[PDB]
């Protein structure tokens, strides 16, 4: 353990840091929200890392140039933590050799080859870090990046000349919505999907949900913006089409007041939790049709009257 | 044959070369595509179709390739 | 004289702020308040600590975070790790159980289910109690007829 308090609280400084490791993970374990807490972990976790990288730096193991157990801890450690993260070691060569270092010990390689040695799983079953008895995989890692971008959807507003405020490029998250879809179908194929799928199935009537109301609500933008160049504006067009204008304005509240509580959300998916929004929209998408019919019924009739505007446009 | 494989010895030898040996990926050549619905009745749900040609392709095979899809390339010339 | 970095509460320095006083070493403090949470962050990075964060101690160019092995340190650089093998190994123990009893209560602390989590602390911590008021028979203070520094751990915990 050391000779005496400073060779001693060195080697301690060891156990700490393999502890600060063993323990952090512990504490993130229990927690439902794991698959989105990880990050703010993994952000701090440098700093802890470098002090070990560095003491690494021209010596064979912590704690100087005779063997001691910190390198047989950094091992299994090492080991550990490229579960958690993929990355997390990379950064870190001097590690990931004094890893395979340690696994070439003869007496550990004859270890790690012998029935003694436990494979897996890193925590007690009953954790959601490293439990579990099935060993394999990626239909949670997959799902967490799907949820985890669905609490990032963005939609760029910018507001135009009039009240309403306007939803800018939405083929982003139309495309995505349609592939995250498709994702979700080609993960029935999967063996290893079938209890874990059940909320897969959620997460699907989710977002068929989302498409509902996303195919609705840019028919809605679309048409709206467009009838709004021919009468929205001219005192005089508004004029000669009263029932028209009067059907227009009416609509134009509501949408107002549906777009301005769907922003101030400020989820996307959340949209879909909002009260009667696919029902809303396709009557407003009716009605809005209504008029564009209207007034197209209105330009033939004025044009078969004086069949020169016919050559106008 | 209870797909609808031809009588032919001719093509009997081909489809057991296709299927036989799988060390590598199999490259069909067939001016009528009736074997793109042979191999399809062999494999029922897991049969996936794709196309070199077609937009969604690369992501498409990123999801055929995690979950065991089965999958047929429509467009062999193009690659 | 050492300086020490804590936030003005009990909290992580309590134990080492009685050796310290035990051993009438006198010392300097920088004080973090609890809304305070700015002037932390703007000292986190400006100190040269080896694990950054609360508590975090300097002396002649030791820098440690990690109560127990800052507290250790100040006690090793008075002799005071134990006078054999068995002694030594005796007071490392004695460090662990008092963390086990630290740590124990922060794990049930934060917990919105509180009101019933402390009721399995406090059953564990009969078994932890005990032990010492075993060790205190035929004993002046727990590990002997001299007082520890595991002692002055207990108390922060106890408290």
Avoid at chain 1, 252 to 278: C, G, W
Avoid at chain 3, 48 to 68: A, C, H, R, W
Wanted: aromatic share 12%; net charge negative.
């Amino acid at each position: 353990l050391g000779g005496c308090p400073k060779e001693r609280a060195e080697i301690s400084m060891l156990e700490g840091a393999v502890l600060d490791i063993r323990y952090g993970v512990s504490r993130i374990a229990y927690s439902k929200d794991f698959e989105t807490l990880k990050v703010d972990f993994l952000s701090k976790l440098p700093e802890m890392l470098k002090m070990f990288e560095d003491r690494l730096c021209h010596k064979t193991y912590l704690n100087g140039d005779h063997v001691t157990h910190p390198d047989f801890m950094l091992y299994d450690a090492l080991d550990v933590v490229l579960y958690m993260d993929p990355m997390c070691l990379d950064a870190f060569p001097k590690l990931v050799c004094f890893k395979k270092r340690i696994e070439a010990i003869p007496q550990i390689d004859k270890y790690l080859k012998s029935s003694k040695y436990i494979a897996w799983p890193l925590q007690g079953w009953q954790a959601t870090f490293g439990g579990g008895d099935h060993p394999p995989f990626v239909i949670e890692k997959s799902l967490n990046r799907i949820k985890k971008f669905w609490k990032e959807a963005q939609y760029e507003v910018i507001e135009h000349s009039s009240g309403l405020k306007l939803v800018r490029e939405w083929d982003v998250l139309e495309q995505a919505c349609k592939e995250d879809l498709e994702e979700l179908v080609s993960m029935k194929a999967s063996n290893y999907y079938k209890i874990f799928e059940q909320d897969c199935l959620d997460l699907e009537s989710k977002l068929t949900k989302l498409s509902e109301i996303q195919v609705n609500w840019v028919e809605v933008q679309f048409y709206w913006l467009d009838l709004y160049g021919i009468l929205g504006e001219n005192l005089d067009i508004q004029n000669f089409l009263p029932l028209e204008t009067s059907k227009f304005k009416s609509l134009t509240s509501e949408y107002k007041m549906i777009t301005t509580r769907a922003f101030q959300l400020d989820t996307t998916i959340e949209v879909i939790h909002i009260p009667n929004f696919d029902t809303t929209l396709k009557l407003t998408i009716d009605s809005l049709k209504m008029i564009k019919s209207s007034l197209s019924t209105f330009l033939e009739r004025q044009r078969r009257q004086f069949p020169r505007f016919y050559f106008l446009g | 044959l209870e797909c609808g494989l031809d009588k032919n010895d001719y093509f009997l030898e081909n489809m057991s070369i296709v299927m036989n040996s799988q060390d590598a990926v199999p490259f069909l050549l067939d001016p009528s595509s009736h074997m793109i619905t042979v191999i399809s009745n062999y494999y029922g749900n897991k049969t996936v179709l794709l196309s070199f040609l077609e937009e969604g392709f690369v992501k498409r095979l990123e999801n055929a390739i995690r979950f065991g899809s089965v999958v047929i390339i429509q467009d062999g010339e193009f690659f | 004289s050492p300086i020490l970095g804590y936030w003005k509460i009990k909290g992580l320095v309590q134990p080492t702020r009685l050796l310290l006083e035990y051993l009438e070493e006198k010392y300097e403090e920088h004080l973090y308040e609890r809304d305070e949470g700015d002037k932390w962050r703007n000292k986190k990075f400006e100190l040269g600590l080896e694990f950054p964060n609360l508590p975090y101690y300097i002396d002649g160019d030791v820098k440690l975070t990690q109560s127990m092995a800052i507290i250790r340190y100040i006690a090793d650089k008075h002799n005071m790790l134990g006078g054999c093998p068995k002694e030594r190994a005796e007071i490392s123990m004695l460090e662990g159980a008092v963390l086990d009893i630290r740590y124990g209560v922060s794990r049930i602390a934060y917990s919105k289910d509180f009101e019933t989590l402390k009721v399995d602390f406090l059953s564990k911590l009969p078994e932890m109690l005990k032990m010492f008021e075993d060790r205190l028979c035929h004993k002046t203070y727990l590990n002997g007829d001299h007082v520890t520094h595991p002692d002055f751990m207990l108390y922060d915990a106890l408290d």
